[PDB]
């Protein structure tokens, strides 16, 4: 019996980068058990949406650990390639229900977890590069969510503004790209003016306004994979996997998808090693009412495996099961 | 926190009318929760196909319990009217996908569950009234399925045929209608003669040929309801609801249906009491691309409620949600 530190996105009054839970487990404990123990602690309704992402701290290596995998078997395997201080385990929401935001507002621990997760990704990945009107609104909205006391024109008084700027930092709400490039108090005639259009909202209306604003410049509701379809004339595409498109491919005309299969039609999921000279990842989906299986060639076995995990998650969610649709050969 | 006895169709080597599960539930458990607790044990994939039927033993009263209803609230209501020993709760497959047989072969616990359920209904409802050629093959196919070690030339020998007479029982495979009207040894010239055409079939092929033969004389892939359509000039019809017709009404020509809507078109379901002469149940479906709702007028609220459950089950199955399409005004 050992213990495991899982970073997660359930908020407390500490600093975001320290949010975590230490879970102790046996050699029969699987990843599903780890997940239920952490969220049940927070009275989460939508347990089936959560998964466990293992990232290598010193590269781009990432493994989504399947709910059926044993934690000890997993911890034993990945500690061979790298030392324990080189791995980060985080709980993320990965499998979204159809109409997830509406369904998440009806389960507020998860609505917030998702909000935290999406905001965090937003900062670490696209906050610096985004239209600075957007970066403003999103920032204002998070201030409005934590500090429900700064109503209407209350940030225009200076003795509350400095509670947010000089000591703690504005970098908690705004990208560094924007806090540097504009002047010390041209920034706050912009913030106080921007704040006014959201000053009336409670926190839940703020969380939802956050998503409305962010979605058109950052699709957090899907995952895309560069890969190739076919068993004879292999064509390379960008697959889009998500709640409202099922399995789709991008047709160069934005993230707007062309449909391929519904999760309800996927009967079996299968992923192997590429039988030849390169180390590509293979993926086969048996689709109902379709003679040919859907064959996917991914750049690596790691990526094939991560994709199988995403598709199995939606399959489980869309039927009402805990049983995996993945098989062996 | 109480216990509940749910009859079902997962086979064990006990006696068939005694197959059941005792599930423990609290006062937050919904029907969906009961169903999950029963099926997860058997690695069932298509959980969204299952529903829960409550029948009163001392009348013809039947209530389909909606997955969102809470078990204890339901159970309190019907235990007011009659004591527990007069109620039977059975898990049933009620919502079928298009190409359901094909879909079930890739989830054999359900294929087996469905077979048992359909075979049971057959014996309890129409086995006695069906052409005795049909009764012969159907009875035989269960034998070829039940004893998977016994090959084709094994029933022609007299000393194992009576292993099925004296110990197991012939009433287990054939209607009493047939075991009585033909004599003991004209009947085995009949069983042995019929059995030979199915001797190569394994268990999966036995089940599928069972459905193949049964389907033309007993529709187990649909439900029919006597009711009336329209909001003004009410016409009385027989609705036929199922995977291969969606919502249809019958028009004189057998169970041969006229199409009305596909489940994918159903936007909202709404069912209330008739403010009119009888305690009729009203049922309104908003259909996409039709300005006018489809109004269904049923003989009682109970039938209206049972129809709402069927249509909602299919709406959930066909889209991929747990979210109900039933709205409550």
Curated annotation (Swiss-Prot), chains A, B:
Please list the tissues where expression of this protein has been recorded: Detected in B and T-lymphocytes. Isoform 1 and isoform 6 are detected in lung fibroblasts (at protein level). Ubiquitous. Expressed in epithelial cells (at protein level).
Q: What is known of its domains?
A: The Pro-rich regions interact with the SH3 domain of CAS family members, such as BCAR1 and NEDD9, and with the GTPase activating protein ARHGAP26. The C-terminal region is the site of focal adhesion targeting (FAT) sequence which mediates the localization of FAK1 to focal adhesions.
Q: Which domain of life is it from?
A: Eukaryota
Q: How does it assemble?
A: Interacts (via first Pro-rich region) with CAS family members (via SH3 domain), including BCAR1, BCAR3, and CASS4. Interacts with NEDD9 (via SH3 domain). Interacts with GIT1. Interacts with SORBS1. Interacts with ARHGEF28. Interacts with SHB. Part of a complex composed of THSD1, PTK2/FAK1, TLN1 and VCL. Interacts with PXN and TLN1. Interacts with STAT1. Interacts with DCC. Interacts with WASL. Interacts with ARHGEF7. Interacts with GRB2 and GRB7. Component of a complex that contains at least FER, CTTN and PTK2/FAK1. Interacts with BMX. Interacts with TGFB1I1. Interacts with STEAP4.
- In which compartments does the protein localize? Cell junction, Focal adhesion; Cell membrane; Cytoplasm, Perinuclear region; Cytoplasm, Cell cortex
Q: Which residues form the FERM domain?
A: 2-322
Question: Where does the record place the modification Phosphoserine?
Answer: 21
- What kind of modification does the protein receive after translation? Phosphorylated on tyrosine residues upon activation, e.g. upon integrin signaling.
Q: What is the lineage of its organism?
A: Eukaryota, Metazoa, Chordata, Craniata, Vertebrata
User: What is the name of the protein in this document?
Assistant: Focal adhesion kinase 1
Q: Which disease is it linked to?
A: Aberrant PTK2/FAK1 expression may play a role in cancer cell proliferation, migration and invasion, in tumor formation and metastasis. PTK2/FAK1 overexpression is seen in many types of cancer.
User: Entire protein: which part is shown?
Assistant: 34 to 362 of 1052
Q: Where is this cross-link: Glycyl lysine isopeptide (Lys-Gly) (interchain with G-Cter in SUMO)?
A: 119
Q: Where would you find the membrane-spanning parts of this chain?
A: none
* Family assignment from sequence similarity: Belongs to the protein kinase superfamily. Tyr protein kinase family. FAK subfamily.
Q: What does this protein do?
A: Non-receptor protein-tyrosine kinase that plays an essential role in regulating cell migration, adhesion, spreading, reorganization of the actin cytoskeleton, formation and disassembly of focal adhesions and cell protrusions, cell cycle progression, cell proliferation and apoptosis. Required for early embryonic development and placenta development. Required for embryonic angiogenesis, normal cardiomyocyte migration and proliferation, and normal heart development.
């Amino acid at each position: 019996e050992r213990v495991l530190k899982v970073f997660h996105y359930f908020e407390s009054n500490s600093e975001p980068t320290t949010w975590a839970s230490i879970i102790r487990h046996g050699d029969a404990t699987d990843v599903r058990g780890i997940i239920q123990k952490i969220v049940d602690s927070h009275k989460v309704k939508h347990v089936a949406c959560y998964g466990l992402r293992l990232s290598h701290l010193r590269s781009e290596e990432v493994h989504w650990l399947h709910v059926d995998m044993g934690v000890s078997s997993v911890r034993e395997k990945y500690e061979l390639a790298h030392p324990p201080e080189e791995w980060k385990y985080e709980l993320r929401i990965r499998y979204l229900p159809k109409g997830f935001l509406n369904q998440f507002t009806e389960d507020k621990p998860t609505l917030n977890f998702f909000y935290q997760q999406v905001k965090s990704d937003y900062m670490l990945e696209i906050a610096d590069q985004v239209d600075q009107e957007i970066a403003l609104k999103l920032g204002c909205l998070e201030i409005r969510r934590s500090y429900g006391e700064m109503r209407g024109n209350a940030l225009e008084k200076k003795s509350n503004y400095e509670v947010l700027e000089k000591d703690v930092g504005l970098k908690r709400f705004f990208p560094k790209s924007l806090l540097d490039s504009v002047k010390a108090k041209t920034l706050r005639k912009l913030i106080q003016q921007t704040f006014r259009q959201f000053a009336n909202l409670n926190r839940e209306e703020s969380i939802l306004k956050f998503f409305e604003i962010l979605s058109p410049v950052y699709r957090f509701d899907k995952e895309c994979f560069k890969c190739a379809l076919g068993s004879s004339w292999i064509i390379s595409v960008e697959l889009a996997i998500g709640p409202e498109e099922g399995i789709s491919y991008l047709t160069d005309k934005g993230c707007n998808p062309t449909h391929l299969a519904d999760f309800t039609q996927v009967q079996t999921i299968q992923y192997s090693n590429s039988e030849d000279k390169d180390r590509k990842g293979m993926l086969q989906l048996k689709i109902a009412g379709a003679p040919e299986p859907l064959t996917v060639t991914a750049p690596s076995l790691t990526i094939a495996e991560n994709m199988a995990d995403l598709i199995d998650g939606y399959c489980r969610l869309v039927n009402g099961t805990s049983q995996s649709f993945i098989i062996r050969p």
